[PDB]
């Protein structure tokens, strides 16, 4: 047969494989119109009717992210200095830091940083109107691809943290409860269990107050987050999670207790001995219109205050166990108002079975004050919008509303809004919902706030800096104060109040507080994990250090690095005065190793830098100063001489006399040209230094060697106490199209070979560390080469390194990445002790079936029926889903536990010393690998996005083993798979393709039998 | 002094540098409300009134891309098989291939593929309502980050090609014009110079027809693209560009000639010997309403057909011989209708000075015709929308409009639309613009189409597959046929018609055509550039070939690669039968070298794969079959033995006997551990093979050696005819958090050291090629290691290699990348002959000041004033720009553009042999680098997006040399800069930072004085 031709059945599998075209393609406009419908993914501008949404409370947020999407978006963020997104966030979240943690896979560190400044971090990630807050300030707005999805990232890290089931702990910087001053046992009352009080109580408990009680009028907690924000934007279990974290600090909540005249008043709290009160009761009553007087729910009239709590009670499992069914709202629905409460009423009405929804507002579209992302949800669900209409009469016939009569409104040219009595609209409707906003009007409630001063709007007056009312022991915040519009601003109000309540209370007990406000951070048992390590007789407080590189150009930067938390630092390599060098410029350039991607996260750098231009005297004095001021931070002096015994002994003695904890010998000196490339040269250098000094020293090995183990062995034979693996990889980063290099020095555009650093050399450095650790068990290794996160650092520890040197990751960012690395490592260690989470990969949950970060409903009639998410298949999916939601109307939904129990560590948290070298057991020669335990690829069709990359890779780089369906664009791996794993490697969807154990007989294809 | 302590002035420059916090931050809600306005970038939802737009015709497209953004978005595209975006494109653009070209920086290749299927490719990139076309089918809709911006990428690549000023050429496959059959001289008439006829005429010219004339009624060309689509969505210079490309093919345009009775008719056309006619006149008349009868423009009434041409003549230089100012549209404007014409009327009325615009339509929001992107332009410019209103009466007082009276509409229970005579609106207005659509009404024009049949819709009937009317010689397409709603569908109508006009004409001359339509592609002189190369006596038709690797697992795969265009291929390395191997699985994994980015563009792979599992008999028979069928494609047999003279001589002789053009010796065999790591072993292996075979052979070198030049030298000394540099780099690609590796093999989850391939190892391979080329001048080198584009291929050729082997870029994609590589290399070479383009870097234009890929205005009052693009500074920028637009109305603004004259090569096009090794002159030792020719960084404040990364990097990795302003977030480089170049290397904006010569003395910072 013709071996080099595909037989017919492979020709058939290859039918959809890309081919070179030699001609333009002919397809009539009519045929194209018909075919368009088959592939359509997005809304059709020509479908006018609502999708069926009755009883469908699935998440409709455009911002929700899965891990794949969050990692992409977090790597996109520029992680800006003095970031305007944080300036534009009411709780001042350090967005740069938490997004850096997500990009580094440290979801715990991101959550800790979110919740440190916002105790409702998850709620706010889901609901913040970010376009009017943090995202409206984002610098990447100035790029075509646009601002960062900050809320979605916040939601994602916070959801992973919620899944970790880790409790909040008492501020570990506090003395124990019995040694707290009496002031902290002051009885504190908060009124209302909404965002403002939850935040205030949280921060007060962080400060150490131990007698905090929130009194809540209703039988549910969470305020509007629970009672009115729809489940399809804010799942109730988020609210319950955040309140659980609060209760970990000891805050008490008492339901069914009202601030009201014959119940709780400021006076009775005072006589009962309460020392401070926070008023966070919001705006409890609807804004009304006299034309609706006497209308009842039975006739079809609701305020938002009637309607949204009814829908919440039906759709939130355990919010209020008592449920009526979804209100019977079939028919045309009129929603009055253009604030964001109106838009939630409209989309909720659709879930009650509304036939059509009209939002009617009395001004124009330009005057809508709802945030665009709220408006877009009602728009895409095909609500109708009627501007310039003010209601006048509700027509009732047969006990039911049948119509509303409006008059047209208009502006003149003084901005006056007029009502034109001769211009009317008679709009038929079965249900009317007024969403004119909320007010405080209950006389018995206001009476209970006596004698605090109220303003013009009958709201309590506060000092906007302190949140104090006219009574110095009574504070107020959130909606009740009429400043905040949002959850995050209400949270911030309680935060702001908490510091001045603390000041007020301490003053009352005769104590002062800091003039600079100091609210504590958020803490969990993860933060107690010990990440110190001992190596070569040295104690490192954590295993992360600055490599000898641009970030250690000056000793003043090492100082700032130690202040930021770095465990150790190398000096820039320095030499004797006779060997002083002079740098050229340009000399450090971005890598081309991952294509024309600019900005954050460069995959490599190339440098043609030399050793330090600063003198040995500068560095030796600097080491003495640094060791004097930072005795617990390890300082390693990096030094270089030529192949000269007196020089190496002189310089190493000088660095030792300066107080360096250890030395690092830079073996890049030219004497095959480098000393580090010759085992005899390295051994001799190491013996010279070993004779000269008593302190530990480490040989820094170059990777540009045939056998790096032979260099490490020679260092160890010469008396080195360990090795640093590795320096940069020799390379040429690239050429412009005219042939000139980059970096190019001088008018001559000259260059020389540089060293490549960063994540592109990580595989080379990992291989070096592992080969050395296996060949020389127990020999200390300092790892360097592409370390940029706690989890990549843990790879090097697992590979045999004891400490972790960093350069490029700081060049890509700044010194504060150390806080990410330390919290990330603590979390990775803590999680190794949790039985319930062993299916995770470090901080990453097991990947569930998902599309656009939202889980695929587990319905029998969707599973395996070959329905991709486009065209007529997508309309069939929607119908199936819609039918299951109708069918679910009739059945009991379970309750979550009254409140969850955290996962308990089942062994002591591993120390760094427990993880070093643990991966070496899996390494071996090729002959130690089983060639009979083979795998094949299998594709989860529910996660596939139909791109055919697996198919193209298997076709032109594999075994032509995948069928790609010409109608559904769904791939199927067949029995000719050889498990090469290329299709998984190129698939855009994490864990859509999985390698599973091959169940069928596996025969190597020999082409022609031997 | 305390050396390790910042002095007060550095502490000051570091004031905004990030620091670890130990406490939560206290900021009042009121203080936050106040500060939010200082940083605000996007629109403020509390603003009910947007800046003056009078006389502002700057581009408002949200999809426009500069090079930085285009490269990022083109890299995001999955470049899908059988792609649904292409299915959803009416012209069937090969979107996968043109976006692949952009991502590889091959903008010529992208434009060629675009214009091959769509002669109005730049117009369409600008105006296609993609959410209802290609982008509506995009698979990345299923991701949170969403669908690809296909139209912007199409626009970007087409704009670059436009800037190259390269002409279209006559289809180079055709015989010379004198040898063309007489049928191709048939007189062809096209009526109307819009998208439909321009397309049809272009494709007919590609087919070889030499006598094509477009008769256009007006004194301007381009149809609605020119007369109505606003300049702030479609610049007229795009239309002029596409028509000049068509004129390159010899198509003739005659303006001021109408299809109409007593002028051009089908009868007069027939009588004058025209053999085919294409009707592309569009819908020339407005759809009218009786309530507007007698209303004239000076009372304030316009149809869209009156108003939009007025704005266009007044905003498009070069359109029209007469210049004119904008219409005087002051006061409140009512636009009637909700198709996209209405939305262009709304936004255009704002450019004319309207105080207020009302879009009033007779159905609801759910019924708006317009694509959402068109609607959003009006919405964001603060137009008001009034639904459910039907006009009933215009109120005229004092001889002009003062109001329009509407009645409310509603849809009855079934679905029919009623009018509520008693529910009225009296809406004050000064100007009314009806946008009810367009029709063909003129009886003089209809009568000139006698006797073709018309349908119910009063429009010419056509076979929708052929575009033929009832008259066999008359075709029609575009708006006139009533199917197309868009520019791209009208272009497609003309493209569809052109094949069947060709069939009809040929048959009239007694000739047949293929039953399979074969429209030619789009060609320029770039396509004639020769990219062949001779090396070691072998002739390569192009320098790109498949490395010995997974893409050459099977010889059937090589066959398909040669069919796709690949110049050469390696067999997977094979051996004698005694040495047969068996692979494990998993064995090839994605790289972690650039982070958790999945899908296209993996920066590396790692493999633990062995040599081929297929027998030497399979491979030798396959080489014979491949060389029999593909004699012009070079086939190199890659072979491996242990260190054994008889084995190497036997295996190389067997491969020679099978007809391999050459051999490649795989030196990975363990005898360091591998043969290729020892010069003496390599020299002996090459000696053995040289004694065994007469064909050329190449030693494949490993980069995992201290000194690769010594191995290369040993191979040369042993008799090798060249070297392949390099194989994969030894590595481990990483572990899971529980410590298990990936790949993980068997129950024990075991692994071994693997080989790293792909762009991550390109610096290593480039070093090896350059260092061998300098040590061994003229010794042939085959490069492998991260080659994934003509641009990167050219780097290796400049570095001394003659041919270019590829693996990982095909693993990342498929075999068709060869077409991108060849057109890319042709364009790179061609552009070296063009003096006018000396300042480009290859295919990249010199970067100019832009924000969001839109050029920043050149206004003295803006530049140097430290106005960044946010907060109150942005507001001041908008007021300055708006005041400058008022001044361009009130001054001498009118000069049509310089008409294009294509750049002419002013030196020979370099051949491959001319560029090989040209970079080597710039390489040397560090001691050859000047230390007086120092540089400093300087920042272009107009391109800065205020992220402060330059500042952070200089602070914590540099010399604390950048001031970062706390109010404007603008950076300034001070004189302490050392030119290290890190700030440029991390800046997200291409060429915002540039390194320039030091003007002041360069003093090395030494910390303490030297002392002796
Ligand atoms: C001195 C020196 C400069 N640059 C590097 O990458 N490594 C070194 O050791
Ligand atoms: S021509 Fe239009 S529809 Fe086709 S790919 Fe380009 S933008 Fe999309
Ligand atoms: S890195 Fe670039 S964009 Fe960012 S502040 Fe510096 S110059 Fe501006």
Short mmCIF file of N, CA, C and O in Angstrom, two decimals, chain A residues 4 24 27 29 32 41 68 82 92 131 136 145 365 384 413 426 489 492-493 519 559 577 581 585 588 613 625 706 747 752 759 767 812 815 832 852 921 923-924 934-935 956 969 1006, chain B residues 4 24 27 29 32-33 41-42 68 82 92 136 139 141 144-145 355 365 384 408 492-493 519 559-560 583 585 593 613 625 706 730 737 750 752 924 933-934 949 956 969 980 1006 1010:
data_model
loop_
_atom_site.label_atom_id
_atom_site.label_comp_id
_atom_site.label_asym_id
_atom_site.label_seq_id
_atom_site.Cartn_x
_atom_site.Cartn_y
_atom_site.Cartn_z
N UNK A 4 2.47 6.68 2.58
CA UNK A 4 2.44 8.12 2.80
C UNK A 4 1.12 8.78 2.38
O UNK A 4 1.06 10.01 2.34
N UNK A 24 -10.78 32.37 -4.22
CA UNK A 24 -11.80 32.92 -3.34
C UNK A 24 -13.02 32.01 -3.35
O UNK A 24 -13.26 31.26 -4.30
N UNK A 27 -20.25 31.79 -2.01
CA UNK A 27 -21.35 31.48 -1.11
C UNK A 27 -22.36 32.60 -1.26
O UNK A 27 -22.03 33.77 -0.99
N UNK A 29 -25.47 35.22 -0.82
CA UNK A 29 -25.92 35.99 0.33
C UNK A 29 -27.11 35.32 0.99
O UNK A 29 -27.22 35.31 2.22
N UNK A 32 -25.88 32.39 3.02
CA UNK A 32 -25.21 32.90 4.21
C UNK A 32 -26.22 33.35 5.27
O UNK A 32 -26.00 33.14 6.46
N UNK A 41 -24.09 32.57 18.64
CA UNK A 41 -23.79 32.49 20.07
C UNK A 41 -24.50 33.54 20.90
O UNK A 41 -24.94 33.26 22.03
N UNK A 68 -10.22 29.71 35.22
CA UNK A 68 -9.58 30.00 33.94
C UNK A 68 -9.70 31.48 33.57
O UNK A 68 -8.70 32.12 33.19
N UNK A 82 -0.10 53.29 43.24
CA UNK A 82 -1.01 54.33 43.75
C UNK A 82 -2.37 54.25 43.03
O UNK A 82 -2.96 55.26 42.64
N UNK A 92 -11.50 51.36 50.10
CA UNK A 92 -10.05 51.46 49.88
C UNK A 92 -9.35 50.11 49.75
O UNK A 92 -8.21 49.93 50.18
N UNK A 131 -18.78 50.24 37.68
CA UNK A 131 -18.52 51.24 36.64
C UNK A 131 -18.59 52.65 37.20
O UNK A 131 -18.04 53.58 36.59
N UNK A 136 -14.51 52.48 37.17
CA UNK A 136 -14.50 53.77 36.47
C UNK A 136 -13.19 54.53 36.58
O UNK A 136 -12.93 55.45 35.79
N UNK A 145 -8.94 47.09 24.82
CA UNK A 145 -9.57 45.95 25.48
C UNK A 145 -10.24 46.32 26.81
O UNK A 145 -11.11 45.58 27.28
N UNK A 365 -34.46 59.01 29.19
CA UNK A 365 -33.41 57.99 29.32
C UNK A 365 -32.13 58.58 29.88
O UNK A 365 -31.48 57.96 30.73
N UNK A 384 -39.47 46.41 28.49
CA UNK A 384 -39.74 47.62 27.73
C UNK A 384 -39.58 48.85 28.62
O UNK A 384 -39.74 48.77 29.84
N UNK A 413 -37.17 75.12 29.23
CA UNK A 413 -35.76 75.48 29.11
C UNK A 413 -35.31 76.33 30.29
O UNK A 413 -34.41 77.16 30.16
N UNK A 426 -52.96 55.41 28.26
CA UNK A 426 -53.77 54.40 28.93
C UNK A 426 -53.05 53.07 28.68
O UNK A 426 -53.15 52.50 27.59
N UNK A 489 -20.43 51.34 50.27
CA UNK A 489 -20.43 52.59 51.03
C UNK A 489 -21.08 52.42 52.40
O UNK A 489 -20.63 53.05 53.36
N UNK A 492 -18.40 50.77 54.38
CA UNK A 492 -17.43 51.78 54.76
C UNK A 492 -17.91 52.67 55.90
O UNK A 492 -17.12 53.04 56.77
N UNK A 493 -19.19 53.06 55.89
CA UNK A 493 -19.73 53.84 57.00
C UNK A 493 -19.52 53.14 58.35
O UNK A 493 -19.07 53.76 59.31
N UNK A 519 -7.19 50.46 62.09
CA UNK A 519 -8.07 49.31 62.19
C UNK A 519 -7.29 48.05 61.86
O UNK A 519 -6.47 48.05 60.94
N UNK A 559 17.16 47.26 52.36
CA UNK A 559 16.48 47.73 53.58
C UNK A 559 14.97 47.76 53.38
O UNK A 559 14.21 47.20 54.17
N UNK A 577 38.68 46.45 44.29
CA UNK A 577 38.70 47.73 43.58
C UNK A 577 39.36 47.61 42.22
O UNK A 577 38.92 48.24 41.25
N UNK A 581 33.89 47.59 37.58
CA UNK A 581 33.36 47.52 36.22
C UNK A 581 32.55 48.77 35.93
O UNK A 581 32.21 49.55 36.82
N UNK A 585 24.61 50.87 28.47
CA UNK A 585 23.18 50.99 28.34
C UNK A 585 22.86 51.11 26.86
O UNK A 585 23.68 51.62 26.09
N UNK A 588 19.07 45.89 29.95
CA UNK A 588 18.04 44.93 30.33
C UNK A 588 16.84 45.14 29.41
O UNK A 588 16.34 46.27 29.27
N UNK A 613 28.53 48.10 40.05
CA UNK A 613 29.44 49.23 39.88
C UNK A 613 29.83 49.87 41.21
O UNK A 613 30.66 50.79 41.22
N UNK A 625 25.62 47.78 58.30
CA UNK A 625 24.41 48.55 58.64
C UNK A 625 23.15 47.69 58.59
O UNK A 625 22.29 47.77 59.48
N UNK A 706 27.47 21.42 30.35
CA UNK A 706 27.01 20.10 29.96
C UNK A 706 26.49 19.31 31.16
O UNK A 706 25.44 18.66 31.09
N UNK A 747 25.98 53.92 18.46
CA UNK A 747 25.61 54.13 17.07
C UNK A 747 25.84 52.88 16.24
O UNK A 747 25.12 52.65 15.26
N UNK A 752 26.15 41.89 22.78
CA UNK A 752 26.88 40.68 23.13
C UNK A 752 25.86 39.72 23.71
O UNK A 752 24.72 40.10 23.97
N UNK A 759 10.45 33.46 33.97
CA UNK A 759 9.72 32.19 33.99
C UNK A 759 10.09 31.30 32.80
O UNK A 759 9.93 30.08 32.89
N UNK A 767 15.11 21.70 36.55
CA UNK A 767 15.87 20.50 36.24
C UNK A 767 17.22 20.50 36.96
O UNK A 767 17.64 19.48 37.50
N UNK A 812 9.22 42.65 37.31
CA UNK A 812 7.87 42.74 36.75
C UNK A 812 6.90 43.49 37.66
O UNK A 812 5.77 43.77 37.24
N UNK A 815 8.59 45.25 45.47
CA UNK A 815 9.01 44.45 46.62
C UNK A 815 7.83 43.86 47.39
O UNK A 815 8.02 42.86 48.10
N UNK A 832 -2.63 21.36 53.22
CA UNK A 832 -2.18 19.99 53.26
C UNK A 832 -2.71 19.23 54.48
O UNK A 832 -2.66 18.00 54.48
N UNK A 852 -18.51 29.85 30.87
CA UNK A 852 -18.37 31.24 31.31
C UNK A 852 -18.34 31.36 32.83
O UNK A 852 -18.98 32.24 33.41
N UNK A 921 11.05 11.60 44.73
CA UNK A 921 10.65 10.21 44.62
C UNK A 921 9.99 9.90 43.27
O UNK A 921 10.07 8.77 42.78
N UNK A 923 10.82 11.26 40.35
CA UNK A 923 11.74 11.38 39.23
C UNK A 923 12.45 10.06 38.98
O UNK A 923 12.61 9.24 39.89
N UNK A 924 12.87 9.85 37.74
CA UNK A 924 13.72 8.72 37.46
C UNK A 924 14.26 8.76 36.05
O UNK A 924 14.10 9.75 35.32
N UNK A 934 -0.70 3.13 29.94
CA UNK A 934 -0.88 4.19 28.97
C UNK A 934 -2.18 4.93 29.26
O UNK A 934 -3.05 4.42 29.98
N UNK A 935 -2.34 6.12 28.68
CA UNK A 935 -3.57 6.88 28.85
C UNK A 935 -4.11 7.28 27.49
O UNK A 935 -3.42 7.19 26.47
N UNK A 956 -2.42 17.56 12.72
CA UNK A 956 -1.18 17.97 12.09
C UNK A 956 0.02 17.78 13.00
O UNK A 956 1.15 18.07 12.60
N UNK A 969 -19.73 20.98 16.08
CA UNK A 969 -18.35 21.34 16.43
C UNK A 969 -17.97 20.76 17.81
O UNK A 969 -17.28 21.40 18.62
N UNK A 1006 3.48 0.64 14.03
CA UNK A 1006 4.81 0.44 13.47
C UNK A 1006 4.93 0.87 12.01
O UNK A 1006 6.05 0.89 11.48
N UNK B 4 22.96 52.56 53.46
CA UNK B 4 21.82 51.68 53.18
C UNK B 4 20.49 52.34 53.49
O UNK B 4 19.51 51.63 53.77
N UNK B 24 -6.00 48.15 58.29
CA UNK B 24 -6.99 48.60 57.33
C UNK B 24 -6.99 50.13 57.29
O UNK B 24 -6.61 50.80 58.24
N UNK B 27 -11.08 55.87 55.46
CA UNK B 27 -11.41 56.92 54.50
C UNK B 27 -12.91 57.11 54.55
O UNK B 27 -13.65 56.15 54.32
N UNK B 29 -16.81 57.93 53.69
CA UNK B 29 -17.64 57.80 52.49
C UNK B 29 -17.77 59.13 51.75
O UNK B 29 -17.79 59.17 50.51
N UNK B 32 -14.51 59.84 50.03
CA UNK B 32 -14.40 58.98 48.85
C UNK B 32 -15.27 59.48 47.69
O UNK B 32 -14.83 59.44 46.54
N UNK B 33 -16.49 59.94 47.97
CA UNK B 33 -17.32 60.49 46.90
C UNK B 33 -16.62 61.65 46.20
O UNK B 33 -16.65 61.76 44.96
N UNK B 41 -12.32 57.73 34.62
CA UNK B 41 -11.98 57.49 33.22
C UNK B 41 -13.19 57.37 32.29
O UNK B 41 -13.17 57.93 31.19
N UNK B 42 -14.22 56.63 32.71
CA UNK B 42 -15.36 56.25 31.87
C UNK B 42 -16.46 57.30 31.99
O UNK B 42 -16.28 58.28 32.72
N UNK B 68 -0.46 47.70 19.23
CA UNK B 68 -0.42 47.04 20.54
C UNK B 68 -1.71 46.27 20.82
O UNK B 68 -1.68 45.08 21.18
N UNK B 82 -12.67 25.13 11.04
CA UNK B 82 -14.00 25.23 10.46
C UNK B 82 -14.78 26.38 11.09
O UNK B 82 -15.93 26.24 11.49
N UNK B 92 -17.36 35.19 3.55
CA UNK B 92 -16.62 33.97 3.88
C UNK B 92 -15.13 34.23 4.12
O UNK B 92 -14.28 33.44 3.71
N UNK B 136 -20.96 37.35 15.99
CA UNK B 136 -22.10 36.65 16.56
C UNK B 136 -21.94 35.15 16.60
O UNK B 136 -22.63 34.48 17.38
N UNK B 139 -16.55 31.54 18.80
CA UNK B 139 -16.55 30.58 19.90
C UNK B 139 -16.17 31.21 21.23
O UNK B 139 -16.65 30.76 22.28
N UNK B 141 -17.29 33.75 22.48
CA UNK B 141 -18.47 34.21 23.22
C UNK B 141 -18.71 33.35 24.45
O UNK B 141 -19.26 33.83 25.46
N UNK B 144 -15.78 34.30 29.57
CA UNK B 144 -16.08 35.56 30.25
C UNK B 144 -15.49 36.76 29.52
O UNK B 144 -16.12 37.81 29.43
N UNK B 145 -14.28 36.63 28.98
CA UNK B 145 -13.70 37.79 28.29
C UNK B 145 -14.35 38.05 26.93
O UNK B 145 -14.17 39.12 26.36
N UNK B 355 -28.93 71.20 19.69
CA UNK B 355 -29.01 71.29 21.15
C UNK B 355 -29.49 70.00 21.77
O UNK B 355 -29.13 69.69 22.92
N UNK B 365 -38.56 49.44 22.21
CA UNK B 365 -37.12 49.21 22.24
C UNK B 365 -36.76 47.82 21.75
O UNK B 365 -35.80 47.66 20.99
N UNK B 384 -32.02 61.24 23.17
CA UNK B 384 -33.22 60.77 23.85
C UNK B 384 -33.97 59.80 22.94
O UNK B 384 -34.00 59.96 21.72
N UNK B 408 -49.92 57.65 20.20
CA UNK B 408 -49.31 56.49 20.82
C UNK B 408 -49.74 55.23 20.07
O UNK B 408 -50.87 55.12 19.59
N UNK B 492 -20.70 40.86 -1.33
CA UNK B 492 -20.87 39.46 -1.66
C UNK B 492 -21.79 39.27 -2.86
O UNK B 492 -21.58 38.36 -3.67
N UNK B 493 -22.84 40.09 -2.98
CA UNK B 493 -23.69 39.99 -4.17
C UNK B 493 -22.90 40.18 -5.45
O UNK B 493 -23.14 39.49 -6.45
N UNK B 519 -12.98 31.86 -8.24
CA UNK B 519 -12.57 33.26 -8.30
C UNK B 519 -11.11 33.39 -7.85
O UNK B 519 -10.70 32.72 -6.90
N UNK B 559 3.18 14.53 3.55
CA UNK B 559 2.49 14.72 2.27
C UNK B 559 1.52 15.90 2.36
O UNK B 559 1.52 16.77 1.48
N UNK B 560 0.71 15.97 3.42
CA UNK B 560 -0.22 17.09 3.53
C UNK B 560 0.52 18.41 3.77
O UNK B 560 0.07 19.45 3.29
N UNK B 583 6.87 4.31 23.09
CA UNK B 583 6.60 5.53 23.83
C UNK B 583 5.75 5.26 25.07
O UNK B 583 4.99 4.29 25.13
N UNK B 585 2.91 7.37 27.81
CA UNK B 585 1.91 8.42 27.81
C UNK B 585 1.49 8.69 29.25
O UNK B 585 1.44 7.75 30.06
N UNK B 593 5.92 28.31 31.01
CA UNK B 593 6.94 29.35 30.88
C UNK B 593 6.37 30.75 30.79
O UNK B 593 7.14 31.71 30.86
N UNK B 613 8.35 5.43 16.56
CA UNK B 613 7.94 4.04 16.75
C UNK B 613 7.75 3.30 15.43
O UNK B 613 7.48 2.09 15.45
N UNK B 625 8.22 7.25 -1.73
CA UNK B 625 6.91 7.72 -2.21
C UNK B 625 6.83 9.23 -2.22
O UNK B 625 6.24 9.83 -3.13
N UNK B 706 28.25 22.66 27.21
CA UNK B 706 29.02 23.84 27.60
C UNK B 706 29.41 24.68 26.38
O UNK B 706 29.28 25.90 26.39
N UNK B 730 17.08 20.61 27.94
CA UNK B 730 16.71 19.69 29.01
C UNK B 730 16.01 20.46 30.13
O UNK B 730 16.49 21.51 30.57
N UNK B 737 0.83 20.98 43.30
CA UNK B 737 1.10 21.40 44.67
C UNK B 737 1.28 20.22 45.62
O UNK B 737 1.83 20.40 46.71
N UNK B 750 5.17 8.93 37.76
CA UNK B 750 6.60 9.15 37.59
C UNK B 750 6.88 10.05 36.39
O UNK B 750 6.04 10.24 35.51
N UNK B 752 10.49 11.84 33.92
CA UNK B 752 11.91 11.97 33.67
C UNK B 752 12.14 13.34 33.05
O UNK B 752 11.20 14.05 32.68
N UNK B 924 29.49 40.62 19.25
CA UNK B 924 30.87 40.56 19.68
C UNK B 924 30.95 40.38 21.17
O UNK B 924 29.96 40.04 21.83
N UNK B 933 28.71 55.76 25.07
CA UNK B 933 27.46 55.95 24.34
C UNK B 933 26.30 55.44 25.18
O UNK B 933 25.64 54.44 24.87
N UNK B 934 26.04 56.16 26.27
CA UNK B 934 24.98 55.78 27.19
C UNK B 934 23.66 56.38 26.75
O UNK B 934 23.60 57.35 25.99
N UNK B 949 4.15 51.62 36.30
CA UNK B 949 5.01 50.44 36.34
C UNK B 949 6.46 50.82 36.12
O UNK B 949 7.37 50.22 36.71
N UNK B 956 12.22 49.57 42.69
CA UNK B 956 12.55 48.33 43.38
C UNK B 956 13.45 47.44 42.55
O UNK B 956 13.85 46.37 43.04
N UNK B 969 -0.65 61.26 37.92
CA UNK B 969 -0.07 59.94 37.64
C UNK B 969 0.71 59.93 36.33
O UNK B 969 0.62 59.00 35.53
N UNK B 980 19.36 51.66 32.16
CA UNK B 980 19.28 50.21 32.30
C UNK B 980 18.21 49.60 31.38
O UNK B 980 18.40 48.47 30.89
N UNK B 1006 29.07 54.87 42.37
CA UNK B 1006 30.00 53.93 42.99
C UNK B 1006 29.83 53.76 44.49
O UNK B 1006 30.50 52.90 45.08
N UNK B 1010 36.50 55.29 45.44
CA UNK B 1010 37.19 54.04 45.11
C UNK B 1010 38.24 53.67 46.16
O UNK B 1010 38.17 52.60 46.76
#
